[PDB]
């Protein structure tokens, strides 16, 4: 490393790993210089209100850092620099962040009340190009309509992307803000309106003006109201006026939130697609049905040559009997079909026309396909498969690609990095080993979700050499203490488990009961533990014994979400000389 410092930096530029990067800092002062100097992303590990952060060496700096996440910051849910309950302290903290993080072009934040934005934006206005807001808590009632977003659209002159995907507000906030700030929204190109997956959807009276106000939009992601029982639902007329209002769109992704035929037609979707020449990513995950969609897809091939990624909800006539009817669509990098009954083993074989494109394929609730030509699309350019609610298919036997396959969503394997399994009420994991998943040398990630109305065979996963990241979602299972024991029995035997995300179940706070703590606690390898719901203060010390646990947090990221003993815990957690 006698080389010129600029080339040491250029080397360190390429490190994605936070921990490896953290370890490079500890090598020598020379490459500590080099790591602080080149780091691009940082998710803060707060509390930044505490004097440990503020009065801290002021050559602790990340001068070329771009993306700063302040949503994970302790305590988890709480307001950041709200001026609601004093300025002076918010002023100073703001400047401190602005001093380690001066080149932020991209900011994530937890945003209970709009004054946090008003207190962060001054330092970064001229730089800020992307914003993610995050709010699983309820919306402060007294605020007046589009007030949550006024701080951004007034100040940040260089804003190009807005991400409300995990931000609980009302649609009338979004519509009010984005139509009364033309100077700001005329520049917007990316918009994500998820709204914490807690709305019935944007209406046509809402969706229409937003597009109207956003000519440069190149990406839109939105939940829309498609249910024609309602007079203001999203029709062909609404889709048409979106397309002519946002011509530049390359990524459009509508979907119906839920828990019968749609107001959309097939000649309407042909016109619509003719308006969107640039459409690379299309996605219409609706619950209502869109009959005989065969043509619309051929249109999409002709009108939208640049298409690659494609995902369709209840689109009923995708492919069929005879010859080319969605497979006119020459390039599909990825494709996913859904609650589409007209799909039949005839179809999947008939995609002899997407030989070059489809690295990903999925069917969700198709009820008419077989085992052995999910054994027929076997070719060299194919890598990742879901298969969700097949009344018929249950099998991994089908596959040439057992050698080539890389992810799997079902309900030796020589390249399979990832695996997402969905189960039922008191289903057993174990049969999975005998049913065809025995080896998995390279399997790093596994994801388990449960939903319904002896023990889990979690121990039976210890076969797998490199299995380090689990996500165990029991949120949707619907006393609970014995249920958490059923599911968590034998995590200890997962030797290489490094990072665990656990969702405890819901009955009217999502508490993680004592036997679960003690079951999780026996995990030796855990460097990161995140628990969706919480515990009691008096249950918290028990995680401190896990040898090298460093990252741990109680992230209630579900709507509506609901004590600085946690901070007392956090100090005790940091205290311990753990590994580097």
């Amino acid at each position: 490393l006698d080389l010129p410092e600029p080339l040491l930096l250029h080397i360190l530029s390429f490190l994605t790993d936070v921990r490896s990067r953290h370890r490079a800092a500890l090598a020598c002062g020379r490459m500590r210089a080099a790591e602080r100097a080149t780091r691009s992303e940082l998710s803060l590990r707060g509390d930044p209100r505490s004097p440990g952060f503020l009065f801290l060496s002021h050559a602790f700096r990340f001068p070329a850092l771009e993306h700063l996440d302040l949503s994970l910051v302790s305590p988890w849910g709480h307001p950041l620099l709200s001026s609601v309950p004093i300025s002076e302290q918010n002023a100073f903290i703001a400047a401190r962040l602005a001093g380690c993080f001066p080149a932020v072009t991209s900011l994530a934040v937890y945003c209970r009340d709009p004054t946090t934005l008003a207190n962060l934006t001054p330092h970064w206005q001229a730089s800020l190009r992307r914003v993610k807001l995050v709010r699983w808590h309820q919306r402060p009632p007294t605020l007046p309509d589009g007030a949550d977003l006024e701080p951004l659209l007034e100040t940040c002159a260089a804003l190009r992307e807005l991400d409300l995907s995990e931000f609980y507000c009302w649609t009338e906030d979004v519509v009010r803000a984005l139509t009364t700030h033309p100077s700001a929204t005329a520049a917007l190109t990316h918009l994500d309106l998820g709204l914490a997956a807690a709305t019935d959807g944007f209406k046509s009276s809402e969706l229409g003006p937003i597009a109207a106000s956003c000519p440069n939009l190149r990406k839109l992601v939105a939940p829309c109201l498609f249910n024609p029982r309602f007079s203001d639902c999203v029709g062909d007329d609404a889709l048409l006026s979106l397309a002519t209002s946002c011509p530049r769109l390359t990524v459009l992704r509508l979907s119906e939130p839920f828990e019968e035929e749609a107001a959309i037609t097939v000649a309407g979707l042909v016109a619509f697609f003719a308006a969107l020449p640039a459409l690379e990513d299309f996605t219409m995950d609706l619950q209502h049905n869109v009959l005989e969609a065969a043509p619309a897809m051929e249109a999409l091939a002709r009108r939208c040559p640049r298409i690659k990624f494609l995902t369709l909800g209840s689109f009923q006539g995708l492919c069929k009997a005879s010859w080319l009817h969605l497979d006119g669509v020459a390039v599909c990098g990825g494709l996913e079909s859904l609650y589409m009954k007209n799909c039949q083993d005839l179809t999947d074989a008939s995609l002899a026309a997407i030989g070059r494109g489809c690295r990903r394929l999925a069917k969700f609730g198709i009820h008419g396909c077989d085992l052995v030509t999910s054994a027929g699309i076997r070719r060299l350019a194919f890598t990742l498969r879901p298969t969700l609610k097949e009344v018929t298919v249950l099998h991994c036997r089908l596959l040439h690609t057992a050698e080539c396959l890389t992810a799997l969503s079902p309900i030796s394997w020589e390249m399979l990095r990832s695996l997402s399994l969905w189960f039922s009420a008191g289903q057993l994991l174990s049969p999975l080993i005998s049913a065809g998943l025995d080896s998995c040398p390279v399997l790093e990630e596994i994801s388990i979700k449960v939903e319904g109305d002896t023990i889990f065979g979690l121990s039976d996963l210890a076969g797998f050499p490199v299995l380090a990241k689990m996500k165990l979602d029991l949120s949707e299972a619907v006393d609970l203490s014995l249920w958490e024991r059923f599911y968590l029995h034998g995590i200890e035997s997962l030797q290489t488990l490094y990072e665990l995300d656990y969702w405890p179940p819901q009955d009217k706070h999502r508490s993680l009961t004592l036997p679960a703590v003690g079951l999780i606690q026996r995990c030796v390898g855990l460097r990161k533990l995140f628990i969706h719901g919480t515990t009691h203060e008096h249950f918290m010390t028990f995680f401190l014994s896990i040898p090298n646990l460093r990252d741990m947090q109680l992230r209630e990221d579900y709507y509506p979400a609901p004590a600085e003993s946690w901070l007392r815990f956090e100090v005790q957690l940091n205290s311990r000389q753990i590994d580097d």
Partner: protein, 74 residues
């Protein structure tokens, strides 16, 4: 061209040196990213062997570097 990138240790570093001398943007990245992968995964001391480095930190600076990294989730 990953097949190209096997080579001795000084033959990689020396390649970086004379890869930005002749201004080849593409080869500079490929060479640098390959040193970067050598560092990924290793512990602090294990990084100090692979490249013949000498800890130039008082134990007060180490624990200072350590306390600052605690403001970043891994």
């Amino acid at each position: 061209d990953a097949d190209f990138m096997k080579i001795d240790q000084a033959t990689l570093f020396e390649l970086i040196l004379a890869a930005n001398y002749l201004n080849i943007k593409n080869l500079l990245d490929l060479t640098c990213q390959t040193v970067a992968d050598m560092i990924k995964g290793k512990t602090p001391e294990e990084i100090r062997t692979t490249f013949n480095i000498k800890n130039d930190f008082t134990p007060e600076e180490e624990e200072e570097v350590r306390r600052e990294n605690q403001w970043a989730f891994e």
